[PDB]
Amino acid sequence: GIALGMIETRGLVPAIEAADAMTKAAEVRLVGRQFVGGGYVTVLVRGETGAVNAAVRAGADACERVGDGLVAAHIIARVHSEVENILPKAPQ
């Protein structure tokens, strides 16, 4: 699919927990783990809108009480072709 689900957390341990929760809670493929600097880490998944809704909700709950906590949890159901340039194609 093309929907995008992003969770931003203060640190990497909360981000890994969210990424684990997202991927195992619905059919979504993890596409990147970007260190934003200043302690923020953003895990991005792509999939269909229904699956992304389920995953991010599962991810937001899992990492809320982990480490420093959760910063953001956003779901863009369809992503403009322009944004696709900056979004990571596959994890590093």
Q: Which residues bind a second copy (CB under 8 A)?
A: 2-4, 6-8, 10-17, 19-20, 23-30, 32-43, 48-55, 58, 66-68, 71-83, 85-87, 90-92
Residue 91 as a binder of another protein (CB under 8 A): the answer is no
Among the listed residues 29, 34, 50, 87, the single contact to another protein using CB under 8 A? 50
- Among the listed residues 7, 9, 15, the one whose alpha carbon sits nearest the alpha carbon of residue 73: 7
Q: Indicate which of a second copy, another protein, none lies near residue 56 (CB less than 5 to 8 Å, by partner kind).
A: another protein
Size of the site for another protein (CB under 8 A): 44
CA distances from 34 to 15, 45, 50, 55, 87 (A): 10, 12, 24, 18, 10
What does DSSP say about strands 3-10 and 40-47: parallel, antiparallel, or unpaired?
A: antiparallel
